[PDB]
Write an enzyme that holds these catalytic residues in place. Structure first.
Site, PDB file in Angstrom:
ATOM      1  CE1 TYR A  73      42.852  42.251  44.141  1.00  0.00           C
ATOM      2  CE2 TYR A  73      44.254  41.322  42.393  1.00  0.00           C
ATOM      3  CZ  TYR A  73      43.318  41.154  43.424  1.00  0.00           C
ATOM      4  OH  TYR A  73      42.898  39.913  43.760  1.00  0.00           O
ATOM      5  CE  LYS A 122      45.299  37.490  42.852  1.00  0.00           C
ATOM      6  NZ  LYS A 122      45.183  38.147  44.180  1.00  0.00           N
ATOM      7  CD  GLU A 182      49.596  40.118  42.113  1.00  0.00           C
ATOM      8  OE1 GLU A 182      48.347  40.298  42.087  1.00  0.00           O
ATOM      9  OE2 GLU A 182      50.307  40.459  43.101  1.00  0.00           O
ATOM     10  CB  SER A 203      40.000  37.427  51.077  1.00  0.00           C
ATOM     11  OG  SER A 203      41.369  37.513  51.451  1.00  0.00           O
ATOM     12  CB  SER A 220      41.531  37.457  44.600  1.00  0.00           C
ATOM     13  OG  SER A 220      40.562  38.468  44.447  1.00  0.00           O
ATOM     14  CE  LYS A 243      40.775  39.635  40.923  1.00  0.00           C
ATOM     15  NZ  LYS A 243      39.746  39.098  41.872  1.00  0.00           N
TER      16      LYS A 243
END
EC number: 3.5.2.6
Length: 367
Positions: A150, A315, A272, A318, A64, A67
């Site tokens: 999410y 962030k 984030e 995995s 992730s 992202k």
């Protein structure tokens, strides 16, 4: 109070050695960014069977953390005037004719607010037609812009739509607009056969594993990279004043803008953010899957707040066999990257990274 290499090396070792033992991690690569400079630390094995050591060139799956690349590429597209977060999703995918899509904006896809898109695109989806069926059949549990859940199926789609006006395939758009400008030349959506000698194996319950192909994989979880490129990625995001490509610089700023507030976190594009100073427990509690993966009410920031320097920007990411985390504080120009070839609990990652960065800000000089 300028912390020496040696004292930094000892801080990292003292946290990472016991972590890898307690979490049964074969291999880890760490970078600490401090006073304009990355410092690299490698531990253990990239490949247990072949006894190959992790190096600063070993490739890891970001899962992730991919992202963040999606959010920045999407920010670059906005900065190019090719898309607007305010646009309906149907503007970029007119085939999404289902009534549940009216009112869903590119903003919502990007920030997990579409109304309950799931954590992963279903394994049954293998092509465009089956992907369309998936989004067409999907029934939101909330109205748009009210709940954050999410979802790789949400930002994944945002990434595929963002690149449509470019006329380029996603991989090509990402390489041309993000990776090449930042000289991230060992960062791959698809690892070439020539690079496989550097590619770590992932490990899960004693089995060697690598991520499987999937629809929207590149947009949601498919990036692989080594600790050097990842450090350089963090530096570009931490200090965008050093990004010579103008639209990419503006994209980075958009990806760290604050769109929604969810308790102590703000949602950017992929990134984030928590406000700094933030206590360890606040960051660590936030990463527990009981919070991270829960549907939560959002508060819109109108208009979106531009990047705050005093932020913990981070962030997790995995795959089946890999566990990684990155964080940085733009105000302090410090940051950390921890790449591993086992997926261990997110709160353990955050606690370690936070410990190391804290030890970097509160170092002692007494000997």
């Amino acid at each position: 109070t300028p912390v020496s290499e040696k004292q930094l090396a000892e801080v990292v070792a003292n946290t990472v050695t016991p972590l890898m033992k307690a979490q049964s991690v074969p291999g880890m690569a760490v970078a600490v960014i401090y006073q304009g400079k990355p410092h690299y630390y490698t531990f253990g094995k990239a490949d247990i069977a072949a006894n190959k050591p992790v190096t600063p060139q070993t490739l890891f799956e970001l899962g992730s953390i991919s992202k963040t690349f999606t959010g920045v590429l999407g920010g670059d597209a906005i900065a190019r005037g090719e898309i607007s977060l305010d646009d309906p999703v149907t503007r970029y995918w007119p085939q999404l004719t289902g009534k549940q899509w009216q009112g869903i904006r590119m903003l919502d896809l990007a920030t997990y607010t579409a109304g309950g898109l799931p954590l992963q695109v279903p394994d049954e989806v293998t092509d465009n037609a089956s992907l369309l069926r998936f989004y067409q059949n999907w029934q939101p549990q909330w109205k748009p812009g009210t709940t954050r859940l999410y979802a790789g199926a949400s930002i994944g789609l945002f990434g595929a739509l963002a690149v449509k006006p470019s006329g380029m395939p996603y991989e090509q758009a990402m390489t041309t607009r993000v990776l090449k400008p930042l000289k991230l030349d060992h960062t791959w959506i698809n690892v070439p056969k020539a690079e496989e000698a550097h590619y770590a194996w992932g490990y899960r319950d004693g089995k060697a594993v690598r991520v499987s192909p999937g629809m929207l994989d590149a947009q949601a979880y498919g990036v692989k990279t080594n600790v050097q490129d990842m450090a350089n990625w963090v530096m570009a995001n931490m200090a965008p004043e050093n990004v010579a490509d103008a639209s990419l610089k503006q994209g980075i700023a958009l990806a760290q803008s604050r769109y929604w507030r969810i308790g102590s976190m703000y949602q950017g594009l992929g990134w984030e953010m928590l406000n700094w100073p933030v206590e360890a427990n606040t960051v660590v509690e936030g990463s527990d899957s009981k919070v991270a993966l829960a549907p939560l009410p959002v508060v819109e920031v109108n208009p979106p707040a531009p990047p705050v320097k005093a932020s913990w920007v981070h962030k997790t990411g995995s795959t089946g066999g890999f566990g990684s985390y990155v964080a940085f504080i733009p105000e302090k120009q410090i940051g950390i990257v921890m790449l591993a070839n086992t997926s261990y609990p997110n709160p353990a990652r955050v606690e370690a990274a936070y410990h190391i960065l804290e030890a970097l800000q509160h170092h002692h000089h007494h000997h």
